[PDB]
Amino acid sequence: SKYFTTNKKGEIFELKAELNNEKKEKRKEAVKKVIAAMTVGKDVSSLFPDVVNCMQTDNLELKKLVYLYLMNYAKSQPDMAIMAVNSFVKDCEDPNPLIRALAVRTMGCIRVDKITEYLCEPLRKCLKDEDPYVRKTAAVCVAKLHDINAQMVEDQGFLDSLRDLIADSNPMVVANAVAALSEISESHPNSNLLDLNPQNINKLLTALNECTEWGQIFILDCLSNYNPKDDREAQSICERVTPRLSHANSAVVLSAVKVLMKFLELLPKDSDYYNMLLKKLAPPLVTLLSGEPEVQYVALRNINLIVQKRPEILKQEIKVFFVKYNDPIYVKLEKLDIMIRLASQANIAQVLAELKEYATEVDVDFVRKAVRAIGRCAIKVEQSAERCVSTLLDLIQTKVNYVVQEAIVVIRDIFRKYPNKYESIIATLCENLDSLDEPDARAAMIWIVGEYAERIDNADELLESFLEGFHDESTQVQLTLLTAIVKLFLKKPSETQELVQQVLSLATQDSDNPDLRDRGYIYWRLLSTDPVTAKEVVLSEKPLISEETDLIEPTLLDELICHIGSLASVYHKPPNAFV
Amino acid sequence: MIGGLFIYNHKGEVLISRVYRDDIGRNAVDAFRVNVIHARQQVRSPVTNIARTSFFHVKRSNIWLAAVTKQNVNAAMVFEFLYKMCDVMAAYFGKISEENIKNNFVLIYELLDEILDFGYPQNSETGALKTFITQHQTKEEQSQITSQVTGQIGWRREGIKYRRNELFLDVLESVNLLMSPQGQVLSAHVSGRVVMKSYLSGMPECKFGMNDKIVIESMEQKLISEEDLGKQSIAIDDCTFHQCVRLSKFDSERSISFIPPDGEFELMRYRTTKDIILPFRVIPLVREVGRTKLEVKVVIKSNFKPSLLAQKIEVRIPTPLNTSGVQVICMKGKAKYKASENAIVWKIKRMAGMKESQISAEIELLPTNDKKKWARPPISMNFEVPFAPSGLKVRYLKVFEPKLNYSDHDVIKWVRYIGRSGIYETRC
Amino acid sequence: MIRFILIQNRAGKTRLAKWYMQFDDDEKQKLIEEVHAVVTVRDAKHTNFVEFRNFKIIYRRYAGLYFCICVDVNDNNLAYLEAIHNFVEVLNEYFHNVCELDLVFNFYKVYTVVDEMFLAGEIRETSQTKVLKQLLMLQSLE
Amino acid sequence: GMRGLAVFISDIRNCKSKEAEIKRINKELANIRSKFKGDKALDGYSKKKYVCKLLFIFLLGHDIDFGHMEAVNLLSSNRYTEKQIGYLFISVLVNSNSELIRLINNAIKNDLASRNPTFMGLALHCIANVGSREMAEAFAGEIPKILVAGDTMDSVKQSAALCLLRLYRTSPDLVPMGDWTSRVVHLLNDQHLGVVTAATSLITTLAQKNPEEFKTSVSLAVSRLSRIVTSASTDLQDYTYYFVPAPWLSVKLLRLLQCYPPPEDPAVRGRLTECLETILNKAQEPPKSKKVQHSNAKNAVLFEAISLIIHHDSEPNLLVRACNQLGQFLQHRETNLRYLALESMCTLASSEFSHEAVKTHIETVINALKTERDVSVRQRAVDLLYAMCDRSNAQQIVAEMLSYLETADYSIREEIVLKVAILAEKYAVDYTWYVDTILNLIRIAGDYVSEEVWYRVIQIVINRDDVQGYAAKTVFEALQAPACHENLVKVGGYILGEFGNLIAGDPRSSPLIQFNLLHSKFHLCSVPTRALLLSTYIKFVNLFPEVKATIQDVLRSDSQLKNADVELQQRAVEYLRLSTVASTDILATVLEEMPPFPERESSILAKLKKKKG
Amino acid sequence: DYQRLN
C-alpha cells in the first residue's frame, strides 16, 4: 500500500521491465506505480494490454485495483472495454456475492449500451438475488444506469422490478432502493415514484425506526415529497418523529424539522403536541449551536430561517447568541444579528452597552453591521433611538468614513421612519459631502436634499457643485438627484428652473436608459404641464414601510422549506439560482 | 450522489483522488486547488461555492479534505460522513498522516467506494469490517458476512467471550461557567458524556439508572449513595444519545434500550444548563487610575470541602500592558508572572476547599484607552479537579448476559466523576 | 525587454533568480510559485513562451532544469529561444557536463557570464567562440 | 582560497533538516558577524569568502545590513574578485545611506577614469541596475562621452549602450540630445555588429522619440540591410549563429524602419522590393539543414519583414505571396507554428486587398478551431475572421460561432458574444432575422449579458421601425417560454409594453393573462428590473384599457406600499396616485411612443477596446 | 480520582 507517487522519464519502460516479470512482486509494485500515475492523473491506458494479460489471475486486491484502473481509464478509452466485459461476466459467475457486487459496481460505474445487455438479465438476477450486497449494488448500478439512456423498455422493466423492490425486507437493499428512487425523482417526467400509500408510509416509518440513519434520511426526504391529506395522519407521523431526537443528528434533525414544518402549519390549539414541540424545540436548537462550528454554523443559518418563518418562544433563548472573544468573527456576527432579531427590551440597555463595546473593538465589518443594527433598534422602540442618536453621533465623531458611510443610509431610513426630529445633524452632514464614496450614503444625502430643500436654503450652491457629477455615476444616483430637484422645484420653484432645464436636457440627451429619458419626459410634461398638480401627488406625504428590517420573501422562504436541511435553504439562495 | 472526495496536504497536491461522479473534471479539481488551497485572502468557509458548485473542503487537521459536489444535498450528512471517515481512519490506525494514508491506500479506497458508492453513502457500522477490512472466503464465511450484513445488529456483536465481565465508567463533567467579574454566575452550565469502557463476553443489552425528575435519591452499591433529595439531579436539559439506544423506547417510557459494544465508547452525552456547584468565590476586577495606571483587584475565595484538594492551582491574572510600577499582593501559593502575555500567574502548588488567596495589582500605564482601548482579558482559574458537580449519579445500572451464563452479579462495574473547570474566566 | 531570468531545478526551488526590474519578495515569490506550477502542468506539446495573465515568459524546460526568462508582448520569441539554447550550450560546454553541485559552488560564474552577454534587460552579446574565449580568459580573474 | 565559504557550501548543502540549516546559518552568523562585529576583517580571502556568502544568503532569503561601506572597501580592495563581488552586491543589494551611494558614484567615476574595460563595464552594469538618478545626473552627457567621443571597441560600448538605454527609458529627462545622428548612423554602417545591435536598439528608442530625426538613416540602413540579407553568413563567423545573417540586428533595423511610413520611394524602396522578393523567395525553400533553430530564425525574421510589409497592403502581388504562405502555414504540426501564423494572419486580416483571399480559408479556420482543443489559436482566428467578416459569411458565422460558444469560458464568452453582436450590427440589414439571432443569443444565456448590449439592441428596435410588430410578436413568443432570463424579461417586457399592441389580434395577446404572468415574475428579480416593469405596467393600461381595473386593484397591494426602498416607494406612488386618482387624460398625455433614439456611435466598441489589452 | 466503584 506504501506510497509510490512516481511516473515519468522512461520509468514507464521500467514499469514495463517489472511488468516483464509476471512474478507477483514486480507486478504489485508496478501496480502501485500505476496507482501513482492514476492519482497524479497521468494516463496508463497503454498498459491495458499488459493490464489485461497479467489480469488473468485470481487475486482479490488485484481484482479491485484492476476494477478501478480499467473503469476509470476505459472512461478515457471505451474501445478496449471488450476485455472488461469478459472478466465482469466471469465474476458474475463467481459465487462470492461480495466480489460479485464489486464487479457489479465497477461495471455499472460505466454505461454505454453494450455492457448493458451483457448484464441485463444478470442484473435482473441481482434483483432476483437474496444477498444484500448483490441486490444493493444492483439498485446502485440501476441508479447509475439512469445516468444516460434511462428511457428504454429494458431499463423500464428493471424500474418495475426495483419499484416492487421498494417493498423489500432487506434493510440494505430497501434502503438504497429508497435512496435511488429519491434521486431518480430528479429525473423529471414529474410523474416519478407512484408507490406512495398509507400502509407504505407506515412500513417505511417502522423501517426508519429500525433502519440506519441513511435509510432514515432517505425516508425523510421522500416524506418531504409525499403530501398528506390532513393532520390526523400527520399527527401520527409527528408521533413517529417523537423518537427522532438525538441520533447521528444534524442531517436527520434538519430533515425532520423540514418534514415537520411541512405539517407544522395548523394551530397549537388544534393539538398541544404542536405547542409541546414548540416549547421542547429550544434546547435541541441550542445543541445544534452547541455542536461543532460548521454544524452550529449551518444551525445558525437554519435558525435565522426559522426566526424568519417562526418568530416565537426562542425569543427567550438569545443567551445562545451571547458573543465571546473566542467566538469566530462571523459566528459572532450572526450571534449579534439574531440578538437584535431577538430584541430583549429588558436587556437593550446592557445590550447597547455591549454594542458600543463592540464598536470599540478592532474590526470594521462587524462594527458597520452593529451600526446598522443599532439604527434598526432606533427604528425599533423610540427610547433606544436617543442613545442611538448620541452613540452614532460620537461615532460620526470617530471620523472613520466607512462607519459613517453606511450610517448615513441607516439614519436616512430612520428619519424616513422618523422625520423632522433631529435635523440638527443635517448641518454636520453638510460638511460631510467631501467624502461621498457610497452610492447608498450619497443617495441618502440627496434624499435629505429632496426632503428639506425647502428648509435647506444653502442647497443652491452645494447642488450646483454636485452638478459636477452627471456622468460616471450609477443611474440611481442620477434619479435620486432628479427627484430631489423635482421636490425642490416644487417647494422652491423660484430658482430651480435653470437647474431643472439643464439637467433635463442633459439626462435626456445623454441618456441611455429609456426609463431615465422618459422619466425626464414625464418630469417636464408634468412640470411644464401642471406643477400646480404635481405637488398634490409628490409634495404630499408618502407613508412609511413599517419596520421591514431585512424581511424575507415568503414564497422563497416557503419554498426553501423544501430545502431546510439541503444546501439551498442553509445557503439562503434559491436552489434554482445554482445549477 | 456525490463525486470527487479528495484529501489534501498543505502543499496542495491530493493525498487522495477519490471520485464518485462523471461530471468531475480535472480542470475542475486543479482549479479548486489553486483557488481555495491557494488564495491571497485567508477568510473562507469549510463549504465553498464556485460557479454554482458546492465545495465542502475541510482541513480536519494539518491534513485537508475536499468534498466536491454540484448536487444539492444535506451538507450536514456530508460532514457527518467526513467525520465518520477520519474518525474510523484514526480508530484503525491512530495518527492520520502521509504514511498513515499510504500504507492504508487499498483499504482506504475499497472502504470509501463501499461506504460511499457514486456518492451514495453506505454505512460504516464496522460490525466486522476491520476483520476482513484488514491492513479468501469460505461457505460459512460467505453466508456469515452476508447474514451479518442482513443482521440488524452492529457495534461488534456476534457473541464474544471475555475471561471476566467488567466495565469501568468515567463521568466527565465539563464546567461551562461564566460569572460576572463583580460576582454573578452569568453562565452556569455543564457538558458531560458517559464514556463506557467495558470488558464483557457475549452481546448483552444493558440498562442503567440515573436519577430523574428529582435531585438524586454487586459488591459496592455506592460510596456516596444517593441520599433522598440528594445531589443536583434535574430533567436533563439536553441528553444526547448514540446508535445503540432506542429512543422509541425512551419517548414511550423515558428509557432507551442500549446493546453496548465492548471496549471503550461514549454511551450518551448530556448537558444541563442549571443547578451547579461553585468551587470558588472570586471577584476579579480591574480599575483605572486616570490614564497612567491600571489596577486589578483579584480576591480569590476558594469554596469546596477543605478535604477536597485541587492541585497545580494556576490562575490567569492578566497584568496591564504598559508596566511602569507594579504593586504585588501575596497570600498563599507561588508568585509567578507572565510576560509576552502580560499576566500575573498566581500559580499555587495545591489548594484545599473553602480557601481564599487574594492578589491585588496595580500596573502603571500610558494613555491608550481611547475609542479603541485596552482589551479586558477574562481572569480564569485553571487547575485539576475530579468532581460530580451536579452529583447526578447512578440511580441504578442494569447489565447482564441473558443468553448463557453470566448474570448481573457476574459483572463488576465502575465509574469515575471527573469535573472539568478550565472555563472559569472573568475579568470583563 | 527581459523582465527577469529565473532558473529552477527539478527539485522545485528556483536555482537562479535573475531580475532586471525592482521586483519584490512577494512579487518574485509569486512569480516563482506560479511559473513553477505552470511548468509542472504544462505538458510536452507546449511552446517555450507562456503568457501569464498579462504577458509572457520565454521559458526553457530541461529534465532537471527550467530556464525561465520573462519578456512581455512583442519580442520575437524564436530569437530569444535560440539565444537561450546558445547560452545552455555555452554553460555545459564550459561547465563540462555540469552537475548542479558545480553551480552550487559556481552559481556566481553563471551569473556574471549572464551579466556579460546579457545586460539591462537585453542581450549584451551573442558570439559563441568569442563568448567562450572571453569567459575562459576572464575565468582567471582574481 | 578561503575555507569558510567552501566548507559552508559543502556542509549546508548536506544539511537537510531545516533546523540543521538554521544551525549552520547561525554558526556562519557568529563567524561573519563577530569577524566584522569585532575580530577585524582581513582583506582577500576572508572578505571574498564572507561577502560571497553574505550575497548568496541575501539571495537565500536574507539580507546584509553592514559591510557595504566595507563593500566599498571591496571595490577598494586588490583582488578583482573583491571589487567584482562589491559590484554585484551593491548591484544585487539595493543601497541606502547616500554617503554609501556617494562613495559608490565616486568609485564609479574612478572606474571610468580607470579606462580599462572591466572597471567601466561593471560600473555601467551597476549604474543600469542600481539606477540611481544621480548616475544620469553626473552622467547625462558623460555616458555619451563614454559611448562616443572615443570609439574603440564593441563589448564595453554596447555595455554603455544598454546602460544609457536603461537610463533613457527610465530617465530621458536627464538626457539632453542636441544632435548625435551621424555617429550612430555610421555605427549602422559599422560591420562590427557587436555595437551595432545595441546601437540600433537605442537608436530605435530615440526614433520612437524622433523618427523624423533620422531620414539619413534610411538610405544607409536599407543598403546595409539589403547587404545583410544578401551577405548571409560566409564571414564574421562568430557574428554568425547557425549560418543566419544577423537575425537580431536585422529585425531591429526592419522594425525600426517600420515606424517610418509605407513604401513611397521608387528606387531606394525599389531596392526594398528587391529585399522583399529575396526574403520570400528564400524562405520558401525546404531546409538543406535539419535543425529547427534555422527554421526558428528564418521564420522570426520572416515575421519581422512581413510585419514591416503589413499595414501597407499597397503591394497586391506581395499580399498574394503572403496569403499563400499563410495558407501553407496553418498546417505545421506544432501548435505554436500555426498559432503564431494565426497572429500574423489576424494582424494582416484587415486587408481590403486580400480580405477575400483570407476568407477563402474560412472552413480551414472552422474545422481547425473545432478540432483544436485550445483557445488562444481560436481567438486569433476569431480576430482574423472578424477583420474580414461580412454579411454573406456572417449568416453561417452566427451558427458556427454559437455552436462553439455554448461550450466555452465565461468572460471571453461575454467579449465574444458582444463582438459578434456588434459585427452583426455592422451587417444588420436583415433586422427581423437579426432580431431572431438576438433571441437565440439570449436563449443561450440571456442572464450574463451586460446592460449597454441589450440597451443597444432596444435602441436599434425603436430605431428600426420595421419589425416592431414582428419583434413584439416574437417577444411574446419568448415570453410564453416557461423559463426565465432577466435580461429577456426586461427587454421584451418593455418592448411589449410599448409594442404589445403591434401583436394584439391574437388570443395569446391578452394583457390580463400576460399581466398576471409578469406579476408572478414581478417580485422575483433585481430592483432596476422592477422599475422597468413599473414603466411597462403603466404603459399597459394606457395602451390596453381592458386590463386597467385589474391593474388598478393590484397596484394597491401592501407590497408596493411597503417596499422598503425610497425609490420604488415613490415610483409606485407616482404611478398609483395617477392610476387610482386619474385625470385619465394625463395618462395618454404623458404616454408617448418613446421615439427612435437620437444618433450615437455604439460606444460598445470602445468599451470592448478598453477591455482589449 | 482513581477509585474503585461497583
Coordinates of all heavy atoms in Angstrom, one line a residue, chain D residues 68 145 293 313 317 340 344 349 374 380 409 443 513 538 551 592:
Chain D
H68 N 28.7 47.2 3.7 CA 28.5 47.9 2.4 C 29.5 49.0 2.2 O 30.0 49.2 1.1 CB 27.1 48.4 2.3 CG 26.1 47.4 2.8 ND1 25.8 46.3 2.2 CD2 25.3 47.4 3.9 CE1 24.9 45.6 2.8 NE2 24.6 46.3 3.9
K145 N 30.0 60.7 -23.5 CA 31.4 60.7 -23.6 C 32.1 59.4 -23.5 O 33.2 59.2 -23.8 CB 32.0 61.7 -22.6 CG 31.5 63.1 -22.8 CD 32.2 64.1 -21.9 CE 31.6 64.1 -20.5 NZ 30.2 64.6 -20.5
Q293 N 16.3 25.3 -35.2 CA 16.7 26.6 -34.9 C 16.9 27.5 -36.2 O 16.6 28.7 -36.2 CB 18.1 26.5 -34.2 CG 19.0 25.4 -34.8 CD 18.8 24.1 -34.1 OE1 17.6 23.7 -33.9 NE2 19.9 23.4 -33.8
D313 N -0.1 47.1 -47.5 CA -1.1 46.4 -48.3 C -1.3 47.1 -49.7 O -2.2 46.7 -50.4 CB -2.4 46.2 -47.6 CG -2.3 45.6 -46.3 OD1 -1.6 46.1 -45.4 OD2 -2.9 44.5 -46.1
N317 N 0.6 41.9 -55.3 CA 1.4 40.7 -55.5 C 2.0 40.1 -54.2 O 1.9 38.9 -53.9 CB 2.4 40.9 -56.6 CG 3.3 42.1 -56.2 OD1 3.2 42.7 -55.1 ND2 4.2 42.4 -57.1
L340 N 1.3 31.2 -34.1 CA 1.9 32.5 -34.5 C 1.5 32.9 -35.9 O 1.4 34.1 -36.2 CB 3.4 32.4 -34.3 CG 3.9 31.8 -33.0 CD1 5.4 31.8 -33.0 CD2 3.3 32.6 -31.8
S344 N -0.1 36.4 -37.0 CA 0.3 37.2 -38.1 C -0.8 37.4 -39.1 O -1.0 38.5 -39.7 CB 1.5 36.5 -38.8 OG 1.2 35.1 -39.0
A349 N -5.3 40.4 -41.3 CA -6.6 40.1 -41.7 C -7.4 41.2 -42.3 O -8.4 40.9 -43.0 CB -7.4 39.6 -40.4
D374 N -7.8 24.1 -28.1 CA -7.2 25.2 -27.5 C -8.0 26.5 -27.9 O -8.8 26.4 -28.7 CB -5.7 25.4 -28.0 CG -5.0 26.5 -27.3 OD1 -4.6 26.4 -26.2 OD2 -4.9 27.6 -28.0
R380 N -7.2 34.1 -31.9 CA -6.5 34.7 -33.1 C -7.4 34.5 -34.4 O -7.5 35.4 -35.1 CB -5.2 34.0 -33.3 CG -4.4 33.8 -32.1 CD -4.2 35.0 -31.3 NE -3.6 34.7 -30.0 CZ -4.3 34.4 -28.9 NH1 -5.6 34.2 -29.0 NH2 -3.7 34.1 -27.8
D409 N -15.3 29.4 -22.0 CA -15.2 30.1 -20.8 C -16.2 31.2 -20.7 O -17.1 31.3 -21.6 CB -13.7 30.5 -20.6 CG -13.5 31.0 -19.2 OD1 -13.8 32.2 -18.9 OD2 -12.9 30.2 -18.4
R443 N -31.5 33.3 -25.6 CA -31.9 31.9 -25.2 C -30.8 31.1 -24.8 O -30.9 30.2 -23.9 CB -32.6 31.3 -26.4 CG -32.8 29.8 -26.4 CD -32.8 29.3 -27.8 NE -31.8 29.8 -28.6 CZ -30.5 29.5 -28.5 NH1 -30.1 28.6 -27.6 NH2 -29.6 30.1 -29.3
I513 N -53.8 38.1 -19.0 CA -53.0 36.9 -18.7 C -51.6 37.2 -18.6 O -50.9 36.9 -17.6 CB -53.3 35.8 -19.8 CG1 -54.8 35.4 -19.8 CG2 -52.4 34.6 -19.6 CD1 -55.1 34.5 -21.0
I538 N -47.4 50.7 -16.3 CA -48.1 51.9 -16.5 C -48.3 52.1 -18.0 O -49.3 52.8 -18.4 CB -47.4 53.1 -15.9 CG1 -48.3 54.3 -15.8 CG2 -46.2 53.5 -16.7 CD1 -49.5 54.0 -14.9
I551 N -55.5 46.0 -13.1 CA -54.2 46.7 -12.8 C -54.4 47.7 -11.7 O -53.5 47.7 -10.8 CB -53.7 47.4 -14.1 CG1 -53.5 46.4 -15.2 CG2 -52.4 48.2 -13.7 CD1 -52.5 46.9 -16.3
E592 N -46.1 58.2 -24.5 CA -45.5 58.6 -25.8 C -44.7 57.4 -26.3 O -44.2 56.6 -25.6 CB -44.7 59.8 -25.6 CG -44.1 60.3 -26.9 CD -42.8 59.8 -27.2 OE1 -41.9 59.6 -26.3 OE2 -42.5 59.4 -28.4

